[PDB]
Design a protein around this ligand. Structure first.
Ligand SMILES: Nc1ncnc2c1ncn2[C@@H]1O[C@H](COP(=O)(O)OP(=O)(O)O)[C@@H](O)[C@H]1O
Ligand SMILES: Nc1ncnc2c1ncn2[C@@H]1O[C@H](COP(=O)(O)OP(=O)(O)O)[C@@H](O)[C@H]1O
Ligand SMILES: Nc1ncnc2c1ncn2[C@@H]1O[C@H](COP(=O)(O)OP(=O)(O)O)[C@@H](O)[C@H]1O
Ligand SMILES: [Mg+2]
Ligand SMILES: [Mg+2]
Ligand SMILES: [Mg+2]
Lengths: 524, 524, 524, 85
């Protein structure tokens, strides 16, 4: 409908004020001494979090022009989270510093577009510098330090995470779930496992809980539902000749087959249990080949040249044992060759290098870990429920941070890396003076993440920065201990990827944001 | 949508005031002299209760920030109820004292994150102390004392509950129902009983009331409904041959089976009555195996290897006698070996140790009680329906408290245990001064439950506390008798579990709550 | 219903003000130093653009009469975009200049109709001048310069665009898609390709990802779907006999045909893969003739005179090899005579000059490019989503501008061409004085685009223009370098078509707009 | 702590008025000893008395004693009385 128009300074002032509100709320959660922010929920109990991105999503302003400024700055915090899942609070601070200084430059009559180019060039130079500074983080102690630092300096979190990454491996999958107790627990899963129950509660091999343990079983994979069509007897009787247990994978099994099966198992003629496939057509069908190849078995292609009783005992896969409960089925170890195992993994490389990334890579990776790596689950400890989400969320941030630290390395924390790189870039200049100022402005903004940490500690942000700048390399001030030294020695580490991403995302929105002459919005 | 934001002290002050309103309403219901709170309902007659958790649920505030404070403290009261079902009012009081002192520390300029750690560390130390103070609750008199104390010092309640736990047993099930009369009454049921009536009103053995008593009957368990499938006559005949009564359990019996059956029972050929299974198929089928094993019978596996005709007379379970009426069927004692009964119970151990807890365990235990234990029902007397609500509610609290006291033991009441443990922890300090203050803050908050009891009695909370602190061991002040002495001697007992849970839940919410810098809420 | 009516002077003032608001918002985005405009969305995050047409669309006014003026000027910006996709901001400026001066003439008591046609005569004369000044632009450097100038002086954009036009050719199709990285990337597609995957994932010729490469394959085109009328064996057998791979194009291929086909391909009997036709009935059927003629094959006309079985091996088309994946099918090169390729293209000439224009020629040309030319895709780099649309939008404007520059040539930029033509037309007069004033008004308005650019920069618009007028030929002022010289040397180019279109569209609406005596609108 | 911390403010105020960093100047001044300090007029560090910037000991004392006297006096005040508009 009809819209309100603001030009130049009036538009920018409202924009900045909106930006300041969002940024101020986000800043208080930054650092070891960072403070919690509570998001009010109508639906249920209020949520308290130290996560800047979570706070950013919630904030919208009554003033349409101020709101627009806040909405645009909101995205940098949101984008940083997508990139690495950490440093979102830090990224917002850089946007605050850049925008305020950029607008100040704009007031002078300097061309904003030139200022943007200066900032962008400064950013590009800064990114290259970060890569040179990044030190590899391949040791468990360093990994623990990043986890601990991400989790608002919780030593126990870093400790548990380090244990898990070493254990699962480089390509393994680690997740976190709410714990029943007040104590944090770690679970490690060995071999292939999936969320399938047994269709025959009656057949329990030994332990109670519906637990089935088959010793050196034959594994069958099929593409069809089994009901009245019994004809598969020569395959099933072949198993009887062997005197070994049979594991069945198919779309479904109904009582007719199960009825004969339960009696056959009861008298010891055959020890056989049947379970349903993984779940969805493109899902379960895709995961069947790997199960079969891993166990050395053959998938029955209903679709291709195969039939229900057309398939010898040769076709069935072999495993030393399987554990089945009402909710899950696990194979101890299917017997298959590494070349086939690795080969299945090798064909997975296209699957791994997929445009979708989110959703596709994590489930896919799960197969990868199940096929050769492993799966780890972490339980979170806390007395009620509000404590549990906060504790849990930070652990995930640490989980994401460690994954990032391993792949791209780490840099000194406390904002020292950005301030240290700024000194390095003091000689960078552009096409004209407006660009030179823009460059210089970006360098100025680099300092802010460091000083927010100090500010939140109730100490002079400027005084600490002057001494830190005075220092060399990794020298910096530890907010927790309230003293100077070497940041790396202390254990305060920033994954290079989050540091890099924060600066780039903050700068990307900020350059365009400062160049806005006119803003348009609807009246109340 | 659009957000209203408060920072620092303004946020915390609003939060505190909201918490104070919630806690003030809760406090008046704490102690022997505690007073009732009336909750209004547009639906019908208002509910009056001394139960703090119920009062907490109903409190919501007009001020959006104040409401946020109250909503967060609401959870500690509610969480405590989930754990033990008692001490919810006491837990709220601890939250009140911890929060007020914690915020005061925050005002001082101390880092709240550190304050939280001090509190959390202090809580862990306090919990360990409670276990050492805790003494076993085994005798009936002590159980009665906890029941009596829980039910706002009602002696009759403690007396009746003690009789029931001893009588039913350690794993027995106790419930409470309203009473027809003005007097409290206890009902105890032994053997296997269920809420199933008879399909044939016509077959009444001796007492009229739909009452069927069969002497040395054979019990039939089935997985199908019998409409036109009257065939099974050789089974029925085998029973006619036996000359013994027949009890029938199956999904349903139609008039066709009943019609022939009625004539057969009336002229003396056979005495047979049929009743429909427990209710829902997974649930009825699950309870059928125990019924058969308990009576030494065999469940007919229509599903597995059994048919309607196929089943010998010996398959049927045996019992001394059964009692049947329109609403319920009861078996005096099925004849089964002690080992088999115990064995079903043994497989139930997985069932007992279930992640579900709520609902699954209650029903599970009921099966277990029927299998080997006993079931008790308590009726509550009162002239009016609302009086009945208050009286009954307190009885349940005592029931939960006794269950808690038996499993985890008891500690001295009147808040003496928390104040007594506080003296012990005077030696606890940590990483920094802010933590030390946080620890100290928690110790001070410990005192509050004791003083609220005294405050509600119209006496100086501080003066009684000074003498209590002055005392040793279990020495304390009895609010009801208005004098000092040994609390254990008095008969005032606090189950260790409720006391521990209250402190833990109160502190966990309080630690995060005191660390809040910014609050977000919707506009008026 | 019930209309508010304004006459003469009051109506025109309201109209002018509405126009001025719209124009002023548009004006700030004109030039190298032009500034961005942010459009607020209730849906997602706000949009930031320098594109005048996008801004014009979003502007609606609270005052009903002013809004009417704004809506009326909105079309000139919208029409310019439709004609060339560039020059929309400039067109609005001309409308601003013409209308303001025209209204002033109206105020004098001059006949508006005479003023309007005087303007129209001047416009027609100005257009003729533009063709004379227009110079060819067939060289890559000049094309790059227009791309760079359109993209708000971004050199990298102009460089990449020039490369694509040269390589795909005159009739090639170029589109732009968001890039995953922070860098710009160019993709070129050669040969015949369509967006359809394979219905047989099982048959992969060599590389994974479903990549199928058939060497010297036969191509089958059909108007059929195949279920159980597999009966095409004589055709399939003929191919088996030849030992060559088969590619199948038809409405659908399913289960039974694929099942047998899969076994045949795996064991080496035949190497055959099938893919679904292009998409919709007439659309896919229309594209079948070209596929078959290109490959030298014959489409199976179910409808005309051919049967499923009926078709010899010669009917099938031949290609060197094809590339197939899960979402795309590509033919390296079908062997077909150029006379046939051009002949297919020749029948396309009617298709090319189709009244539909929008949509029809774009897709039609895509077929054309696939038939003989090439297809190019450009990817745009940016850290965040808001940067991404702005960067990409400008690239599209440049893409459209280059297309316009090639077909109609270019003129010197900075508004120099309009100012230069205006000096030439100083001798143009009409039937009466009122027309003569209108002519003069048009010439006067021509100057404005030049001065608006300078005004955006921050320099005196009149001073620069006075010196520019003093100059000759292509002499002008470069806003970005802040100096005078030859605009062509500089690399500042305006496609003749956008320049011409802006002037004609602005003038057409402006003439009618200044002739308004009375306005009709609804009440508040 | 309130009294000691309050002492710092006049220095900071001097520097703040000048448009210089109060925290940075205060930090460096704290490091020094005796009459060493920052001269706001000349923007440099040295012996303030030698430089020519000084206050009588009596005025500094009197200002500090009165400020504390009134502050404490307000802190202990529980009631205020005035006429309505
Ligand atoms: N104890 C500490 N001492 C000094 N710096 C710290 C300490 N803990 C964390 N930091 C730093 O401050 C930054 C922000 O903390 P954090 O709240 O985790 O923000 P993110 O949420 O990481 O923006 C870190 O990336 C790190 O460099
Ligand atoms: N007669 C009494 N004398 C002293 N203390 C008592 C007496 N009765 C109860 N108390 C104490 O006060 C607490 C609060 O009573 P209650 O109403 O049951 O609150 P909860 O609802 O248990 O907070 C008890 O747990 C107990 O320690
Ligand atoms: N650096 C420059 N120096 C002088 N003129 C320029 C420069 N850059 C662009 N222009 C001119 O100003 C016009 C407006 O730019 P543009 O934003 O693309 O508007 P349109 O969107 O073209 O109205 C161009 O068509 C061109 O002639
Ligand atoms: Mg973090
Ligand atoms: Mg109680
Ligand atoms: Mg343009």
């Amino acid at each position: 409908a009809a819209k309100d128009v603001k030009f130049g300074n009036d538009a920018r002032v409202k924009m900045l004020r909106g930006v300041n509100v969002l940024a101020d709320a986000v800043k208080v959660t930054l650092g070891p001494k960072g403070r919690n922010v509570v998001l009010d929920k109508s639906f249920g109990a209020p949520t308290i979090t130290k996560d800047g991105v979570s706070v950013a999503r919630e904030i919208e302003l009554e003033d349409k022009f101020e709101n627009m400024g806040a909405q645009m700055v909101k995205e940098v915090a949101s984008k940083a989270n997508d990139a690495a899942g950490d440093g979102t609070t830090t990224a917002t601070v850089l946007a605050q510093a850049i925008i305020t200084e950029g607008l100040k430059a704009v007031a002078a009559g300097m061309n904003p577009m030139d200022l943007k180019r200066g900032i962008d060039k400064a950013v590009t130079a800064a990114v290259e510098e970060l890569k040179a500074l990044s030190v590899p983080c391949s040791d468990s102690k360093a990994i623990a330090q990043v986890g601990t630092i991400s989790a608002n300096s919780d030593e126990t979190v870093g400790k548990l995470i380090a244990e898990a990454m070493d254990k699962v491996g480089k390509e393994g999958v680690i997740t976190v779930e709410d714990g029943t107790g007040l104590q944090d627990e770690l679970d490690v899963v060995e071999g292939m496992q999936f969320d399938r129950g047994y269709l025959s509660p009656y057949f329990i091999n030994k332990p109670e809980t519906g637990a089935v343990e088959l010793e050196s079983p034959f594994i069958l994979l099929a593409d069809k539902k089994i009901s009245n069509i019994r004809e598969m007897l020569p395959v099933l009787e072949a198993v009887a000749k062997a005197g070994k247990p049979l594991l069945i994978i198919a779309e479904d099994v109904e009582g007719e087959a199960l009825a004969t099966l339960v009696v056959n198992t009861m008298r010891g003629i055959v020890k056989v249990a049947a379970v349903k496939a993984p779940g969805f057509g493109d899902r379960r069908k895709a995961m069947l080949q790997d199960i079969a190849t891993l166990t050395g078995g053959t998938v029955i292609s209903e679709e291709i040249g195969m039939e229900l009783e057309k398939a010898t005992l040769e076709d069935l896969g072999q495993a030393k044992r399987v554990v089945i409960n009402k909710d899950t089925t696990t194979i101890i170890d299917g017997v298959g060759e590494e070349a086939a195992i690795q080969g299945r993994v090798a064909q997975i490389r296209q699957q791994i290098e997929e445009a979708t990334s989110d959703y596709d890579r994590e489930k896919l990776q799960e197969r990868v870990a199940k096929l050769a790596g492993g799966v780890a689950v972490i339980k979170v400890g806390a007395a009620t429920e509000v404590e549990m989400k906060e504790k849990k969320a930070r652990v995930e941030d640490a989980l994401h941070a460690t994954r990032a630290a391993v792949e791209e390395g780490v840099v000194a924390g406390g904002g020292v890396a950005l301030i240290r790189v700024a000194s390095k870039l003091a000689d960078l200049r552009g096409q004209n003076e407006d660009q030179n100022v823009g460059i210089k402005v970006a360098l100025r903004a680099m300092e802010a993440p460091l000083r927010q940490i100090v500010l939140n500690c109730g100490e002079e942000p400027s005084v600490v920065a002057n001494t830190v700048k005075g220092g060399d390399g990794n020298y910096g001030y530890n907010a927790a201990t309230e003293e100077y030294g070497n940041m790396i020695d202390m254990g305060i580490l920033d994954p290079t990827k989050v540091t890099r991403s924060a600066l780039q995302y903050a700068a990307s929105v900020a350059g365009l944001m400062i160049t806005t002459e006119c803003m348009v919005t609807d009246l109340p």
